[PDB]
Symmetry: C3
């Protein structure tokens, strides 16, 4: 239900942010 | 939960702004 | 809701770090 969907959206956002962080790293 | 859904929407909006304004993503 | 709220705070802080990140170009 709603709690499980919130958790999925959170997971998706966490991955989204992690990708940007990795992509903006100092070389 | 309603407040949480609210933060989530606002979070996605900040991400969209980043995705729009930054070159390096 | 406690772990969800923590995860939201952590997201927001990480998003703040991106918003205030260096301009790479």
């Amino acid at each position: 239900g709603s709690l499980e969907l919130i958790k999925l959206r959170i997971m998706e956002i966490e991955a989204r942010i992690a990708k940007i962080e990795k992509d903006r790293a100092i070389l």
